[PDB]
Design a protein around this ligand. Structure first.
Ligand SMILES: Nc1ncnc2c1ncn2[C@@H]1O[C@H](COP(=O)(O)OP(=O)(O)OP(O)(O)=S)[C@@H](O)[C@H]1O
Lengths: 26, 121
């Protein structure tokens, strides 16, 4: 005679980043 | 002195003595440095540029194996701009690169052969 009580959740996945690396052009 | 006397062979023999090897020393060239901008092989680029995390050639060659013998074959061919760096390699024994790490040449051997004269006393 018990119940179910559907529990919640939390999600996470981060992001990246890029770098440009200029070239001195000579 | 003259040519063909065996300056480089004296340096290789010296490296053969106190290593029992012959290739563990660090030979670089001074014939590939005829222009101004190729100084940065032995330093590394400043932060913001293409090859940065790789570091310098001559700098990384000493952070491991800090007992090498260092050669400078025919240091005349470099036009007088490479000389400003080994003006301060000597007599202080330090050199820095892009990361700000400080290598230390405090027990290396600097041997820099030349080619001038050749006919005079
Ligand atoms: N004093 C010496 N004792 C023993 N071997 C020598 C001596 N001088 C010359 N040699 C031999 O002759 C060769 C020429 O000498 P090296 O030192 O290689 O010439 P080098 O000083 O490189 O000339 P340059 O100007 O750089 S083309 C070497 O392979 C040596 O084995």
């Amino acid at each position: 005679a018990a119940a179910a009580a559907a529990a919640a959740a939390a999600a996470a996945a981060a992001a990246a980043a890029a770098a440009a690396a200029a070239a001195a052009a000579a | 002195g003259p040519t063909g006397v065996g300056k480089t062979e004296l340096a290789k023999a010296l490296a053969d003595f106190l290593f029992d090897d012959e290739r563990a020393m660090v030979r670089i060239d001074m014939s590939e440095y005829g222009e101004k901008h190729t100084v940065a092989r032995l330093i590394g680029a400043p932060p913001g540029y293409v090859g940065y995390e790789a570091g310098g050639q001559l700098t990384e060659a000493v952070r491991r194996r800090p007992y090498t013998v260092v050669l400078f074959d025919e240091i005349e061919k470099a036009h007088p701009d490479v000389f400003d760096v080994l003006l301060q390699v000597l007599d202080e024994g330090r050199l820095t690169d892009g990361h700000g790490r400080t290598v230390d040449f405090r027990n290396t051997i600097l041997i820099l052969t030349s080619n001038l004269g050749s006919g005079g006393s």
